[PDB]
Amino acid sequence: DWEIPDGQITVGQRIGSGSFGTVYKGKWHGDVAVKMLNVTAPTPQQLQAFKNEVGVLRKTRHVNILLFMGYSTAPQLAIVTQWCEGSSLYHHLHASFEMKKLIDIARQTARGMDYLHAKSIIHRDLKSNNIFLHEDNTVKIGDFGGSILWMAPEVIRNPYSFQSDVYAFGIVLYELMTGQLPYSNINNRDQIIEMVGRGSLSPDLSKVRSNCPKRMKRLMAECLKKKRDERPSFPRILAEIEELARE
Ligand SMILES: CCCS(=O)(=O)Nc1ccc(F)c(C(=O)c2c[nH]c3ncc(-c4ccc(Cl)cc4)cc23)c1F
């Protein structure tokens, strides 16, 4: 069992919030990250609901997948993981790399994503802010345990699939290769939701830089396919990036 008894974790600085819960930095045999679930008091039925989600995190052992370390039931429900120094991929790309590094970041993410799907785990919300650059070198994918820019057309209108995860990866590719989010010119949610859902809108690939491996863009566009079944699986995506990487 991976339950961490009450009192063992010293919760510190509040880092940020989300629909799910609040993230703090903590102390448990060194630095940890504690996600306080937005649940004052847990019902026995909520308790099982929690265990089921932990049982899914329980089967993630990979260097590119955020390290799940433990879970709390008291005081309140919480997920304990490793502490990632630096910032999210979002903060680097948009808030504050060499083309080689960009590929590496893109490469590690595929490793993590392929591992997850091999474990038959659909992230369901892959985006640059759920990708943490620990030490600014290693990629840590979390929050698989709002943002519509990474949502596949079939998701907007078995909606959630490995293939919709692939699309979210394509957008991530777009972030890396352009250094900016899709539909930046169009700052209207309902507009993007309406236009991408019907197939009239797609990321502008004229933004990618010349110094972008044009083996990538083919792959990017392959993952950004409007049609679900026209997308390559992650094994393919991994092999591809790995093969176009050797250079
Ligand atoms: C392992 C899978 C468990 S999950 O429930 O699916 N995901 C899951 C579960 C618990 C979490 F605490 C977190 C999480 O958020 C973080 C874990 N370590 C971190 N280190 C730094 C930052 C950070 C620091 C500073 C800025 Cl500015 C931004 C982020 C954020 C986190 C998480 F993503």
Can you give the three-state secondary structure of the chain, one letter per residue?
CCECCCCCCEEEEEEEECCCEEEEEEECCCEEEEEEECCCCCCHHHHHHHHHHHHHHCCCCCCCECCEEEEECCCCCEEEECCCCEEEHHHHHHHCCCHHHHHHHHHHHHHHHHHHHHCCCCCCCCCHHHEEEECCCEEEECCCCCCCCCCCHHHHCCCCCHHHHHHHHHHHHHHHHHCCCCCCCCCCHHHHHHHHHHCCCCCCCCCCCCCCCHHHHHHHHHHCCCCHHHCCCHHHHHHHHHHCCCC
Q: How far is the CA of 60 from the centre of ligand 1 (A)?
A: 15
Residue having the nearest C-alpha atom to atom 26 of ligand 1: 87
Alpha carbon distance 54, 69 (integer Å): 10
Place of tokens 């390290």: 67
Nearest to 106 by CA among 212, 183, 202, 205: 212
Q: Measured from the CB, is residue 15 less than 6 Å from ligand 1? A: yes
Alpha carbon distance 94, 111 (integer Å): 23
* Burial class of residue 161, CB neighbours in 10 A (0-12, 13-18, 19+): middle
Q: Measured on CA atoms in the order 179, 183, 186, 189, is the torsion positive or negative?
A: negative
Alpha carbon distance 162, 26 (integer Å): 33
Q: Measured from the CB, is residue 116 less than 6 Å from ligand 1? A: no
List of residues 6+ apart from 217 with CB closer than 8 A: 177, 205, 208
Pairing of strands 131-134, 21-27: unpaired
Q: Which residues pair with 27 in a beta bridge?
A: 10, 31
- Whether the upstream peptide bond of residue 75 has omega within 30° of 0, thus cis, is yes
For each of the domains in the chain, give its residue range(s) and CATH number, in order of start.
1-85 (3.30.200.20), 86-247 (1.10.510.10)
Q: Measured from the CB, is residue 141 less than 6 Å from ligand 1? A: no
Which letter, b or e, does each residue of 201-221 get, where b requires 16 or more Cβ atoms within 10 Å of its Cβ? bbbeeeebeeebbeebbebbe
Alpha carbon distance 88, 147 (integer Å): 15
Cβ–Cβ contacts within 10 Å for residue 67, how many? 19
Q: Measured from the CB, is residue 72 less than 6 Å from ligand 1? A: no
By residue count, the chain amounts to: 247
Alpha carbon distance 88, 143 (integer Å): 12
Q: How far is the CA of 50 from the centre of ligand 1 (A)?
A: 17
CA 115 to centroid of chain Cα atoms = 13
Which letter, b or e, does each residue of 165-174 get, where b requires 16 or more Cβ atoms within 10 Å of its Cβ? bbbbbbbbbb
Method: X-ray
Q: Which residues pair with 72 in a beta bridge?
A: 78
Residue having the nearest C-alpha atom to atom 10 of ligand 1: 35
N- to C-terminal Cα distance for the chain? 44
Closest atom of ligand 1 to CA, residue 84: 20
Q: Is 35 annotated as a binding residue?
A: yes
CA 84 to centroid of chain Cα atoms = 14
Place of tokens 């899914």: 56
Closest atom of ligand 1 to CA, residue 82: 18
Rounded CA Rg of the chain: 19
Alpha-carbon distance values, 165 to 9, 73, 89, 175 (Å): 34, 30, 17, 15
Q: Which residues pair with 24 in a beta bridge?
A: 14, 34
Alpha carbon distance 177, 205 (integer Å): 9
Catalytic residue numbers, as ranges: 125
User: How many angstroms is the resolution?
Assistant: 2.5
Instruction: Specify the amino acid at residue 54.
Output: V
